[PDB]
Amino acid sequence: NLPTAQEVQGLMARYIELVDVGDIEAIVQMYADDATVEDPFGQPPIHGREQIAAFYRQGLGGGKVRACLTGPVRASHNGCGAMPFRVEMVWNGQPCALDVIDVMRFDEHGRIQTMQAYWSEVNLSVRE
Template sequence: MTAEAMRAAMQRYIELVDAGDVDGILALYADDARVEDPVGTPPLIGRTAIERFYHKGLGRNKVHAHLTGPVRVAGNCAAMPFCIELEWDGQPCTIRVIDVMEFNEDGRFQSMKAYWGVDNLELR
């Protein structure tokens, strides 16, 4: 997979999160993918667990997402800094995140790790 194709997939992911398009997001993942969001929590493995995660996160909140810097590519992985704006316990907030995706041979996300914590949550 080319660096350009990985960058395009990462940009597409942000667009789909911003649109709340869970089906579109799931199409980017391999069937046996792993998601660790945030890093340090038990990983979600497989389409069913990942689908539940996105429906829960995007379904309850009006989420807006946008890149805050360029997508970086190394080997079969890509990383990107971005912000998510949403309501956290009824309070508008922004979360600054860095996602790292590992791509499989088919160009789909094999794994996603989201680096963020409470220090990255800004109440508005």
């Protein structure tokens, strides 16, 4: 079952909700066993659930992180989608914010096969 455009919208919105609450195990389950993540895009990809779990545990395990969609999820008819969102975090007690756009490709099992996050320091604020 390759997700329809409508299903892609639901899956990606769910992902943001999982990041928002910080349920690492639930996030890792959304990925295919051999999925790849390029975050940020430009950096070498991480591969497989073990590396992806470590990635999320590192990024979300520490301080509290909040994430919210800032616009609708754009979905295609070939199981892919793109969405704009903002992440709010903390660095040594100081609030920070980042604007990101994630591009995802799902497989015929409704699992994320690949994820690419677009952002750089031009989208970051470490004093807000």
